[PDB]
Amino acid sequence: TVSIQMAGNLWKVHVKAGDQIEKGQEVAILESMKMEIPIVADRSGIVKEVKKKEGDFVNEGDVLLELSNSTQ
Ligand SMILES: *C(=O)CCCC[C@@H]1SC[C@@H]2NC(=O)N[C@@H]21
């Protein structure tokens, strides 16, 4: 559902399975080879799963989130 958009490392994560999110809410942050990039919820919903965690490696198009309200 929500995915990373840049090569980097998932510096922080702010979501868990069962948590509520809203479009534009911060859900993770990239370090990106010493740059900083907020990762915000592409849509509102309840998180079904988080496909990554704090400090995991990530890339453009690499998954981040699955939601019980994207399933629609
Ligand atoms: C390079 O020196 C290794 C660590 C890089 C950490 C980066 S710098 C930009 C991001 N902000 C932060 O606090 N840590 C990330």
PDB file of N, CA, C and O and ligand atoms in Angstrom:
ATOM      1  N   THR A   1       0.808  -1.227   0.000  1.00  0.00           N
ATOM      2  CA  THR A   1       0.000   0.000   0.000  1.00  0.00           C
ATOM      3  C   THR A   1       0.842   1.279   0.000  1.00  0.00           C
ATOM      4  O   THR A   1       1.028   1.824  -1.078  1.00  0.00           O
ATOM      5  N   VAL A   2       1.288   1.809   1.149  1.00  0.00           N
ATOM      6  CA  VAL A   2       2.193   2.959   1.135  1.00  0.00           C
ATOM      7  C   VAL A   2       3.579   2.340   0.909  1.00  0.00           C
ATOM      8  O   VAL A   2       3.808   1.211   1.369  1.00  0.00           O
ATOM      9  N   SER A   3       4.464   3.042   0.212  1.00  0.00           N
ATOM     10  CA  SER A   3       5.784   2.574  -0.168  1.00  0.00           C
ATOM     11  C   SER A   3       6.758   3.752  -0.069  1.00  0.00           C
ATOM     12  O   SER A   3       6.346   4.918  -0.024  1.00  0.00           O
ATOM     13  N   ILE A   4       8.045   3.435   0.003  1.00  0.00           N
ATOM     14  CA  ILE A   4       9.134   4.385  -0.023  1.00  0.00           C
ATOM     15  C   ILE A   4       9.258   4.914  -1.459  1.00  0.00           C
ATOM     16  O   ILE A   4       8.845   4.274  -2.429  1.00  0.00           O
ATOM     17  N   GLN A   5       9.838   6.110  -1.586  1.00  0.00           N
ATOM     18  CA  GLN A   5       9.907   6.875  -2.827  1.00  0.00           C
ATOM     19  C   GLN A   5      11.347   7.312  -3.162  1.00  0.00           C
ATOM     20  O   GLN A   5      11.532   8.122  -4.059  1.00  0.00           O
ATOM     21  N   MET A   6      12.352   6.879  -2.391  1.00  0.00           N
ATOM     22  CA  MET A   6      13.734   7.324  -2.532  1.00  0.00           C
ATOM     23  C   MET A   6      14.641   6.244  -1.925  1.00  0.00           C
ATOM     24  O   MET A   6      14.236   5.531  -1.005  1.00  0.00           O
ATOM     25  N   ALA A   7      15.861   6.101  -2.443  1.00  0.00           N
ATOM     26  CA  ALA A   7      16.888   5.239  -1.867  1.00  0.00           C
ATOM     27  C   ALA A   7      17.288   5.788  -0.498  1.00  0.00           C
ATOM     28  O   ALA A   7      17.526   6.992  -0.395  1.00  0.00           O
ATOM     29  N   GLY A   8      17.386   4.945   0.533  1.00  0.00           N
ATOM     30  CA  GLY A   8      17.725   5.417   1.868  1.00  0.00           C
ATOM     31  C   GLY A   8      17.626   4.324   2.917  1.00  0.00           C
ATOM     32  O   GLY A   8      17.616   3.136   2.595  1.00  0.00           O
ATOM     33  N   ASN A   9      17.536   4.738   4.175  1.00  0.00           N
ATOM     34  CA  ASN A   9      17.502   3.901   5.363  1.00  0.00           C
ATOM     35  C   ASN A   9      16.402   4.476   6.237  1.00  0.00           C
ATOM     36  O   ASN A   9      16.312   5.691   6.424  1.00  0.00           O
ATOM     37  N   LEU A  10      15.535   3.619   6.767  1.00  0.00           N
ATOM     38  CA  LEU A  10      14.283   4.026   7.396  1.00  0.00           C
ATOM     39  C   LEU A  10      14.536   4.528   8.827  1.00  0.00           C
ATOM     40  O   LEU A  10      14.160   3.853   9.781  1.00  0.00           O
ATOM     41  N   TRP A  11      15.223   5.669   8.954  1.00  0.00           N
ATOM     42  CA  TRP A  11      15.700   6.334  10.170  1.00  0.00           C
ATOM     43  C   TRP A  11      14.729   6.214  11.342  1.00  0.00           C
ATOM     44  O   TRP A  11      15.169   5.863  12.439  1.00  0.00           O
ATOM     45  N   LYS A  12      13.436   6.494  11.147  1.00  0.00           N
ATOM     46  CA  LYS A  12      12.437   6.276  12.193  1.00  0.00           C
ATOM     47  C   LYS A  12      11.147   5.748  11.584  1.00  0.00           C
ATOM     48  O   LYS A  12      10.880   6.000  10.406  1.00  0.00           O
ATOM     49  N   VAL A  13      10.319   5.086  12.387  1.00  0.00           N
ATOM     50  CA  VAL A  13       8.998   4.624  11.995  1.00  0.00           C
ATOM     51  C   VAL A  13       8.055   5.028  13.127  1.00  0.00           C
ATOM     52  O   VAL A  13       8.456   5.075  14.288  1.00  0.00           O
ATOM     53  N   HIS A  14       6.806   5.357  12.797  1.00  0.00           N
ATOM     54  CA  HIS A  14       5.854   5.989  13.713  1.00  0.00           C
ATOM     55  C   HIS A  14       4.478   5.321  13.621  1.00  0.00           C
ATOM     56  O   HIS A  14       3.462   5.927  13.941  1.00  0.00           O
ATOM     57  N   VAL A  15       4.449   4.080  13.139  1.00  0.00           N
ATOM     58  CA  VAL A  15       3.244   3.314  12.872  1.00  0.00           C
ATOM     59  C   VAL A  15       3.458   1.907  13.392  1.00  0.00           C
ATOM     60  O   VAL A  15       4.592   1.430  13.475  1.00  0.00           O
ATOM     61  N   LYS A  16       2.367   1.209  13.692  1.00  0.00           N
ATOM     62  CA  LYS A  16       2.366  -0.196  14.089  1.00  0.00           C
ATOM     63  C   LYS A  16       1.121  -0.841  13.499  1.00  0.00           C
ATOM     64  O   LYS A  16       0.163  -0.129  13.216  1.00  0.00           O
ATOM     65  N   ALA A  17       1.101  -2.170  13.370  1.00  0.00           N
ATOM     66  CA  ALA A  17      -0.140  -2.893  13.104  1.00  0.00           C
ATOM     67  C   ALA A  17      -1.213  -2.451  14.106  1.00  0.00           C
ATOM     68  O   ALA A  17      -0.920  -2.360  15.298  1.00  0.00           O
ATOM     69  N   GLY A  18      -2.423  -2.175  13.621  1.00  0.00           N
ATOM     70  CA  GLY A  18      -3.577  -1.764  14.404  1.00  0.00           C
ATOM     71  C   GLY A  18      -3.647  -0.261  14.688  1.00  0.00           C
ATOM     72  O   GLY A  18      -4.662   0.182  15.218  1.00  0.00           O
ATOM     73  N   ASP A  19      -2.615   0.521  14.359  1.00  0.00           N
ATOM     74  CA  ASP A  19      -2.618   1.968  14.584  1.00  0.00           C
ATOM     75  C   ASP A  19      -3.452   2.683  13.516  1.00  0.00           C
ATOM     76  O   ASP A  19      -3.602   2.172  12.404  1.00  0.00           O
ATOM     77  N   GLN A  20      -3.994   3.856  13.828  1.00  0.00           N
ATOM     78  CA  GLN A  20      -4.782   4.671  12.908  1.00  0.00           C
ATOM     79  C   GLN A  20      -3.819   5.674  12.277  1.00  0.00           C
ATOM     80  O   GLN A  20      -3.019   6.284  12.973  1.00  0.00           O
ATOM     81  N   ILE A  21      -3.968   5.947  10.983  1.00  0.00           N
ATOM     82  CA  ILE A  21      -3.241   7.007  10.298  1.00  0.00           C
ATOM     83  C   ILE A  21      -4.225   7.829   9.463  1.00  0.00           C
ATOM     84  O   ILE A  21      -5.359   7.409   9.202  1.00  0.00           O
ATOM     85  N   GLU A  22      -3.768   9.002   9.038  1.00  0.00           N
ATOM     86  CA  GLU A  22      -4.536  10.010   8.337  1.00  0.00           C
ATOM     87  C   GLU A  22      -3.615  10.584   7.265  1.00  0.00           C
ATOM     88  O   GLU A  22      -2.406  10.687   7.479  1.00  0.00           O
ATOM     89  N   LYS A  23      -4.164  10.892   6.091  1.00  0.00           N
ATOM     90  CA  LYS A  23      -3.398  11.381   4.954  1.00  0.00           C
ATOM     91  C   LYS A  23      -2.546  12.592   5.360  1.00  0.00           C
ATOM     92  O   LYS A  23      -3.093  13.587   5.823  1.00  0.00           O
ATOM     93  N   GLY A  24      -1.232  12.521   5.151  1.00  0.00           N
ATOM     94  CA  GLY A  24      -0.311  13.603   5.482  1.00  0.00           C
ATOM     95  C   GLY A  24       0.307  13.473   6.881  1.00  0.00           C
ATOM     96  O   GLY A  24       1.238  14.217   7.192  1.00  0.00           O
ATOM     97  N   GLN A  25      -0.156  12.524   7.711  1.00  0.00           N
ATOM     98  CA  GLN A  25       0.476  12.225   8.994  1.00  0.00           C
ATOM     99  C   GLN A  25       1.832  11.566   8.721  1.00  0.00           C
ATOM    100  O   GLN A  25       1.919  10.714   7.838  1.00  0.00           O
ATOM    101  N   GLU A  26       2.864  11.931   9.479  1.00  0.00           N
ATOM    102  CA  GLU A  26       4.182  11.315   9.434  1.00  0.00           C
ATOM    103  C   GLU A  26       4.047   9.861   9.880  1.00  0.00           C
ATOM    104  O   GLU A  26       3.468   9.596  10.929  1.00  0.00           O
ATOM    105  N   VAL A  27       4.548   8.920   9.081  1.00  0.00           N
ATOM    106  CA  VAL A  27       4.503   7.489   9.371  1.00  0.00           C
ATOM    107  C   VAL A  27       5.916   6.898   9.416  1.00  0.00           C
ATOM    108  O   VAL A  27       6.117   5.891  10.090  1.00  0.00           O
ATOM    109  N   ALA A  28       6.905   7.515   8.764  1.00  0.00           N
ATOM    110  CA  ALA A  28       8.314   7.162   8.880  1.00  0.00           C
ATOM    111  C   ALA A  28       9.180   8.356   8.453  1.00  0.00           C
ATOM    112  O   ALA A  28       8.650   9.368   8.000  1.00  0.00           O
ATOM    113  N   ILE A  29      10.502   8.226   8.540  1.00  0.00           N
ATOM    114  CA  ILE A  29      11.466   9.206   8.050  1.00  0.00           C
ATOM    115  C   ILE A  29      12.585   8.401   7.398  1.00  0.00           C
ATOM    116  O   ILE A  29      12.992   7.374   7.950  1.00  0.00           O
ATOM    117  N   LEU A  30      13.083   8.865   6.251  1.00  0.00           N
ATOM    118  CA  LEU A  30      14.315   8.392   5.644  1.00  0.00           C
ATOM    119  C   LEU A  30      15.462   9.276   6.097  1.00  0.00           C
ATOM    120  O   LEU A  30      15.397  10.501   5.959  1.00  0.00           O
ATOM    121  N   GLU A  31      16.533   8.630   6.544  1.00  0.00           N
ATOM    122  CA  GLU A  31      17.854   9.045   6.119  1.00  0.00           C
ATOM    123  C   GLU A  31      17.972   8.592   4.662  1.00  0.00           C
ATOM    124  O   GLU A  31      17.470   7.524   4.312  1.00  0.00           O
ATOM    125  N   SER A  32      18.624   9.395   3.835  1.00  0.00           N
ATOM    126  CA  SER A  32      18.883   9.112   2.438  1.00  0.00           C
ATOM    127  C   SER A  32      20.298   9.582   2.135  1.00  0.00           C
ATOM    128  O   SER A  32      20.501  10.675   1.605  1.00  0.00           O
ATOM    129  N   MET A  33      21.283   8.771   2.526  1.00  0.00           N
ATOM    130  CA  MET A  33      22.703   8.984   2.263  1.00  0.00           C
ATOM    131  C   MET A  33      23.136  10.356   2.813  1.00  0.00           C
ATOM    132  O   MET A  33      23.887  11.080   2.154  1.00  0.00           O
ATOM    133  N   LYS A  34      22.635  10.685   4.021  1.00  0.00           N
ATOM    134  CA  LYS A  34      22.872  11.886   4.831  1.00  0.00           C
ATOM    135  C   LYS A  34      21.910  13.045   4.530  1.00  0.00           C
ATOM    136  O   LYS A  34      22.086  14.135   5.076  1.00  0.00           O
ATOM    137  N   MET A  35      20.879  12.806   3.709  1.00  0.00           N
ATOM    138  CA  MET A  35      19.740  13.703   3.542  1.00  0.00           C
ATOM    139  C   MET A  35      18.587  13.190   4.410  1.00  0.00           C
ATOM    140  O   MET A  35      18.601  12.038   4.845  1.00  0.00           O
ATOM    141  N   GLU A  36      17.576  14.026   4.623  1.00  0.00           N
ATOM    142  CA  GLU A  36      16.444  13.765   5.497  1.00  0.00           C
ATOM    143  C   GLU A  36      15.168  13.968   4.691  1.00  0.00           C
ATOM    144  O   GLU A  36      15.050  14.952   3.960  1.00  0.00           O
ATOM    145  N   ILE A  37      14.229  13.022   4.763  1.00  0.00           N
ATOM    146  CA  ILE A  37      13.011  13.066   3.961  1.00  0.00           C
ATOM    147  C   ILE A  37      11.881  12.479   4.820  1.00  0.00           C
ATOM    148  O   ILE A  37      11.917  11.279   5.105  1.00  0.00           O
ATOM    149  N   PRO A  38      10.902  13.281   5.282  1.00  0.00           N
ATOM    150  CA  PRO A  38       9.702  12.759   5.929  1.00  0.00           C
ATOM    151  C   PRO A  38       8.969  11.787   5.005  1.00  0.00           C
ATOM    152  O   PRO A  38       8.956  11.980   3.790  1.00  0.00           O
ATOM    153  N   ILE A  39       8.288  10.795   5.575  1.00  0.00           N
ATOM    154  CA  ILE A  39       7.439   9.858   4.859  1.00  0.00           C
ATOM    155  C   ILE A  39       6.093   9.978   5.548  1.00  0.00           C
ATOM    156  O   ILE A  39       5.950   9.682   6.734  1.00  0.00           O
ATOM    157  N   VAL A  40       5.100  10.438   4.806  1.00  0.00           N
ATOM    158  CA  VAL A  40       3.773  10.725   5.311  1.00  0.00           C
ATOM    159  C   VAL A  40       2.796   9.726   4.688  1.00  0.00           C
ATOM    160  O   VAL A  40       3.089   9.130   3.649  1.00  0.00           O
ATOM    161  N   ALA A  41       1.672   9.481   5.359  1.00  0.00           N
ATOM    162  CA  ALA A  41       0.657   8.549   4.921  1.00  0.00           C
ATOM    163  C   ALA A  41       0.045   9.051   3.615  1.00  0.00           C
ATOM    164  O   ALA A  41      -0.548  10.133   3.597  1.00  0.00           O
ATOM    165  N   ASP A  42       0.158   8.250   2.556  1.00  0.00           N
ATOM    166  CA  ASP A  42      -0.499   8.496   1.271  1.00  0.00           C
ATOM    167  C   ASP A  42      -2.030   8.523   1.408  1.00  0.00           C
ATOM    168  O   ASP A  42      -2.727   9.145   0.611  1.00  0.00           O
ATOM    169  N   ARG A  43      -2.590   7.912   2.455  1.00  0.00           N
ATOM    170  CA  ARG A  43      -4.025   7.903   2.721  1.00  0.00           C
ATOM    171  C   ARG A  43      -4.297   7.599   4.187  1.00  0.00           C
ATOM    172  O   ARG A  43      -3.437   7.099   4.914  1.00  0.00           O
ATOM    173  N   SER A  44      -5.521   7.895   4.599  1.00  0.00           N
ATOM    174  CA  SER A  44      -6.024   7.565   5.913  1.00  0.00           C
ATOM    175  C   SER A  44      -6.425   6.092   5.969  1.00  0.00           C
ATOM    176  O   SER A  44      -6.876   5.523   4.968  1.00  0.00           O
ATOM    177  N   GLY A  45      -6.332   5.475   7.142  1.00  0.00           N
ATOM    178  CA  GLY A  45      -6.776   4.117   7.352  1.00  0.00           C
ATOM    179  C   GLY A  45      -6.252   3.555   8.653  1.00  0.00           C
ATOM    180  O   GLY A  45      -5.552   4.245   9.387  1.00  0.00           O
ATOM    181  N   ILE A  46      -6.574   2.298   8.928  1.00  0.00           N
ATOM    182  CA  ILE A  46      -5.970   1.551  10.017  1.00  0.00           C
ATOM    183  C   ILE A  46      -4.871   0.732   9.364  1.00  0.00           C
ATOM    184  O   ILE A  46      -5.084   0.119   8.314  1.00  0.00           O
ATOM    185  N   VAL A  47      -3.701   0.744   9.987  1.00  0.00           N
ATOM    186  CA  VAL A  47      -2.556  -0.055   9.609  1.00  0.00           C
ATOM    187  C   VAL A  47      -2.909  -1.511   9.845  1.00  0.00           C
ATOM    188  O   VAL A  47      -3.268  -1.909  10.951  1.00  0.00           O
ATOM    189  N   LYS A  48      -2.754  -2.302   8.796  1.00  0.00           N
ATOM    190  CA  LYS A  48      -2.793  -3.741   8.880  1.00  0.00           C
ATOM    191  C   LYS A  48      -1.413  -4.277   9.242  1.00  0.00           C
ATOM    192  O   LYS A  48      -1.302  -5.101  10.143  1.00  0.00           O
ATOM    193  N   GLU A  49      -0.372  -3.799   8.562  1.00  0.00           N
ATOM    194  CA  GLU A  49       0.984  -4.284   8.743  1.00  0.00           C
ATOM    195  C   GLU A  49       1.970  -3.179   8.379  1.00  0.00           C
ATOM    196  O   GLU A  49       1.649  -2.300   7.571  1.00  0.00           O
ATOM    197  N   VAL A  50       3.177  -3.256   8.942  1.00  0.00           N
ATOM    198  CA  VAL A  50       4.306  -2.413   8.586  1.00  0.00           C
ATOM    199  C   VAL A  50       5.343  -3.361   7.981  1.00  0.00           C
ATOM    200  O   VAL A  50       5.780  -4.321   8.610  1.00  0.00           O
ATOM    201  N   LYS A  51       5.694  -3.121   6.722  1.00  0.00           N
ATOM    202  CA  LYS A  51       6.534  -3.996   5.911  1.00  0.00           C
ATOM    203  C   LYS A  51       8.022  -3.776   6.171  1.00  0.00           C
ATOM    204  O   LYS A  51       8.844  -4.456   5.564  1.00  0.00           O
ATOM    205  N   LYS A  52       8.365  -2.805   7.017  1.00  0.00           N
ATOM    206  CA  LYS A  52       9.714  -2.407   7.378  1.00  0.00           C
ATOM    207  C   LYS A  52       9.673  -1.972   8.832  1.00  0.00           C
ATOM    208  O   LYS A  52       8.613  -1.919   9.461  1.00  0.00           O
ATOM    209  N   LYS A  53      10.829  -1.603   9.355  1.00  0.00           N
ATOM    210  CA  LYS A  53      10.989  -1.118  10.706  1.00  0.00           C
ATOM    211  C   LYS A  53      12.090  -0.066  10.695  1.00  0.00           C
ATOM    212  O   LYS A  53      12.776   0.114   9.689  1.00  0.00           O
ATOM    213  N   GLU A  54      12.257   0.574  11.839  1.00  0.00           N
ATOM    214  CA  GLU A  54      13.368   1.440  12.179  1.00  0.00           C
ATOM    215  C   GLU A  54      14.694   0.838  11.696  1.00  0.00           C
ATOM    216  O   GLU A  54      15.030  -0.301  12.037  1.00  0.00           O
ATOM    217  N   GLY A  55      15.442   1.602  10.897  1.00  0.00           N
ATOM    218  CA  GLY A  55      16.805   1.274  10.514  1.00  0.00           C
ATOM    219  C   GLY A  55      16.894   0.234   9.398  1.00  0.00           C
ATOM    220  O   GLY A  55      18.007  -0.174   9.076  1.00  0.00           O
ATOM    221  N   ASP A  56      15.769  -0.213   8.824  1.00  0.00           N
ATOM    222  CA  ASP A  56      15.776  -1.129   7.679  1.00  0.00           C
ATOM    223  C   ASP A  56      16.178  -0.385   6.405  1.00  0.00           C
ATOM    224  O   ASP A  56      15.878   0.807   6.265  1.00  0.00           O
ATOM    225  N   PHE A  57      16.820  -1.076   5.463  1.00  0.00           N
ATOM    226  CA  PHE A  57      17.178  -0.512   4.174  1.00  0.00           C
ATOM    227  C   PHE A  57      15.931  -0.446   3.293  1.00  0.00           C
ATOM    228  O   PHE A  57      15.093  -1.356   3.262  1.00  0.00           O
ATOM    229  N   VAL A  58      15.839   0.620   2.503  1.00  0.00           N
ATOM    230  CA  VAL A  58      14.653   0.898   1.716  1.00  0.00           C
ATOM    231  C   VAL A  58      15.017   1.594   0.409  1.00  0.00           C
ATOM    232  O   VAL A  58      16.107   2.146   0.248  1.00  0.00           O
ATOM    233  N   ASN A  59      14.117   1.566  -0.574  1.00  0.00           N
ATOM    234  CA  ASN A  59      14.391   2.127  -1.895  1.00  0.00           C
ATOM    235  C   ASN A  59      13.130   2.641  -2.563  1.00  0.00           C
ATOM    236  O   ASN A  59      12.035   2.414  -2.060  1.00  0.00           O
ATOM    237  N   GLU A  60      13.276   3.361  -3.676  1.00  0.00           N
ATOM    238  CA  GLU A  60      12.135   3.824  -4.451  1.00  0.00           C
ATOM    239  C   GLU A  60      11.284   2.608  -4.851  1.00  0.00           C
ATOM    240  O   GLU A  60      11.802   1.661  -5.440  1.00  0.00           O
ATOM    241  N   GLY A  61       9.999   2.618  -4.486  1.00  0.00           N
ATOM    242  CA  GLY A  61       9.045   1.567  -4.821  1.00  0.00           C
ATOM    243  C   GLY A  61       9.036   0.392  -3.835  1.00  0.00           C
ATOM    244  O   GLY A  61       8.175  -0.479  -3.960  1.00  0.00           O
ATOM    245  N   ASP A  62       9.958   0.364  -2.864  1.00  0.00           N
ATOM    246  CA  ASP A  62      10.009  -0.650  -1.810  1.00  0.00           C
ATOM    247  C   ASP A  62       8.856  -0.380  -0.843  1.00  0.00           C
ATOM    248  O   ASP A  62       8.557   0.774  -0.526  1.00  0.00           O
ATOM    249  N   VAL A  63       8.141  -1.424  -0.437  1.00  0.00           N
ATOM    250  CA  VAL A  63       6.949  -1.311   0.388  1.00  0.00           C
ATOM    251  C   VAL A  63       7.285  -0.768   1.787  1.00  0.00           C
ATOM    252  O   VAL A  63       8.396  -0.905   2.306  1.00  0.00           O
ATOM    253  N   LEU A  64       6.264  -0.202   2.434  1.00  0.00           N
ATOM    254  CA  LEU A  64       6.338   0.326   3.793  1.00  0.00           C
ATOM    255  C   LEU A  64       5.147  -0.152   4.600  1.00  0.00           C
ATOM    256  O   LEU A  64       5.315  -0.567   5.739  1.00  0.00           O
ATOM    257  N   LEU A  65       3.943  -0.116   4.041  1.00  0.00           N
ATOM    258  CA  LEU A  65       2.741  -0.189   4.855  1.00  0.00           C
ATOM    259  C   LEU A  65       1.665  -0.917   4.071  1.00  0.00           C
ATOM    260  O   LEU A  65       1.561  -0.784   2.843  1.00  0.00           O
ATOM    261  N   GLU A  66       0.833  -1.653   4.799  1.00  0.00           N
ATOM    262  CA  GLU A  66      -0.400  -2.230   4.311  1.00  0.00           C
ATOM    263  C   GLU A  66      -1.483  -1.787   5.290  1.00  0.00           C
ATOM    264  O   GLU A  66      -1.228  -1.703   6.492  1.00  0.00           O
ATOM    265  N   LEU A  67      -2.678  -1.464   4.798  1.00  0.00           N
ATOM    266  CA  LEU A  67      -3.731  -0.857   5.612  1.00  0.00           C
ATOM    267  C   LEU A  67      -5.005  -1.653   5.388  1.00  0.00           C
ATOM    268  O   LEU A  67      -5.295  -2.052   4.260  1.00  0.00           O
ATOM    269  N   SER A  68      -5.795  -1.821   6.441  1.00  0.00           N
ATOM    270  CA  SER A  68      -7.117  -2.435   6.440  1.00  0.00           C
ATOM    271  C   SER A  68      -8.149  -1.518   5.784  1.00  0.00           C
ATOM    272  O   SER A  68      -9.271  -1.953   5.560  1.00  0.00           O
ATOM    273  N   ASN A  69      -7.742  -0.280   5.474  1.00  0.00           N
ATOM    274  CA  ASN A  69      -8.482   0.727   4.733  1.00  0.00           C
ATOM    275  C   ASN A  69      -7.647   1.247   3.525  1.00  0.00           C
ATOM    276  O   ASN A  69      -7.507   2.457   3.362  1.00  0.00           O
ATOM    277  N   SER A  70      -7.088   0.363   2.678  1.00  0.00           N
ATOM    278  CA  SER A  70      -6.544   0.643   1.315  1.00  0.00           C
ATOM    279  C   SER A  70      -6.973  -0.406   0.281  1.00  0.00           C
ATOM    280  O   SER A  70      -6.356  -0.532  -0.774  1.00  0.00           O
ATOM    281  N   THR A  71      -7.849  -1.260   0.779  1.00  0.00           N
ATOM    282  CA  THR A  71      -8.144  -2.654   0.503  1.00  0.00           C
ATOM    283  C   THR A  71      -9.434  -2.722  -0.354  1.00  0.00           C
ATOM    284  O   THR A  71      -9.652  -3.673  -1.110  1.00  0.00           O
ATOM    285  N   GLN A  72     -10.267  -1.690  -0.120  1.00  0.00           N
ATOM    286  CA  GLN A  72     -10.831  -0.734  -1.079  1.00  0.00           C
ATOM    287  C   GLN A  72      -9.923  -0.596  -2.296  1.00  0.00           C
ATOM    288  O   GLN A  72     -10.326  -1.110  -3.356  1.00  0.00           O
TER     289      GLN A  72
HETATM  290  C1  LIG B   1      27.235   9.601   8.311  1.00  0.00           C
HETATM  291  O1  LIG B   1      27.998  10.402   8.850  1.00  0.00           O
HETATM  292  C2  LIG B   1      26.544   8.511   9.135  1.00  0.00           C
HETATM  293  C3  LIG B   1      25.236   8.953   9.818  1.00  0.00           C
HETATM  294  C4  LIG B   1      24.249   9.739   8.937  1.00  0.00           C
HETATM  295  C5  LIG B   1      22.980  10.061   9.744  1.00  0.00           C
HETATM  296  C6  LIG B   1      22.015  10.976   8.975  1.00  0.00           C
HETATM  297  S1  LIG B   1      22.555  12.679   8.737  1.00  0.00           S
HETATM  298  C7  LIG B   1      20.876  13.104   8.248  1.00  0.00           C
HETATM  299  C8  LIG B   1      19.901  12.295   9.109  1.00  0.00           C
HETATM  300  N1  LIG B   1      19.638  12.976  10.361  1.00  0.00           N
HETATM  301  C9  LIG B   1      20.064  12.353  11.466  1.00  0.00           C
HETATM  302  O2  LIG B   1      19.962  12.734  12.629  1.00  0.00           O
HETATM  303  N2  LIG B   1      20.611  11.213  11.028  1.00  0.00           N
HETATM  304  C10 LIG B   1      20.600  11.019   9.588  1.00  0.00           C
END
